[PDB]
Amino acid sequence: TQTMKGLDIQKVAGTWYSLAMAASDISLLDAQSAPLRVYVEELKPTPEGDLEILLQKWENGECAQKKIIAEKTKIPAVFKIDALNENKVLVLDTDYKKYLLFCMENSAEPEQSLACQCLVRTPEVDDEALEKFDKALKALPMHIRLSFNPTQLEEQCHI
């Protein structure tokens, strides 16, 4: 997977909304309780170059807040995690002020664990960001794609 060259991770800080998401396995994203159905609400880069990912997940019939610490690697756009049965976070592209495309995978099973998201800065459908999302997904073996309306973006767990 091609990741972003020259990522300045400090510029991704602040509020984001999960506008769209895709996975290689349908079961990873199908239900609301599906293991990779996650909603990014905030990205908090640390001064040491790591990424605190704040997100929402639907578990036990209710919406819960999760925090994931993504550890920096030699490659600026590739981070290490230990959550959601994934071990990697990969930023594909961002303009910092509008959109951000990122993926998650488990390196042991890189085929069946892939989930990617289109994040936007405002709770609006951004078609230009969705075009770039789909252009990035072309070379990826996705079998499920989800997108959300502006009202869903502002609701807890995209209800």
> Which span (16-24, 32-40, 48-56, 104-112) binds Cl ion, by CB under 5 A?
48-56
Q: Which residue is nearest to Cl ion (CB)?
A: 150
Q: Shortest Cβ distance from residue 50 to Y ion (Å)?
A: 5
CB of 148 to Y ion, least distance (A): 13
The residue (of 30 and 50) whose beta carbon lies closer to Y ion is 50
Contact between 88 and 80 (Cβ < 8 Å) = yes
Do 15 and 121 contact (CB within 8 A), yes or no? yes
* Least distance to Cl ion, CB of residue 48, Å: 7
Asked if 150 is part of the footprint of Cl ion (rule: CB under 5 A), the reply reads: yes
Query: Alpha-carbon distance 159 to 156, whole Å?
Result: 6
CA 87 to CA 81: how far, in whole Å? 5
Pairwise CA distance, residues 157 & 159, whole Å? 6
Determine, following the binding rule CB under 5 A, whether residue 50 of this chain makes contact with Y ion.
yes
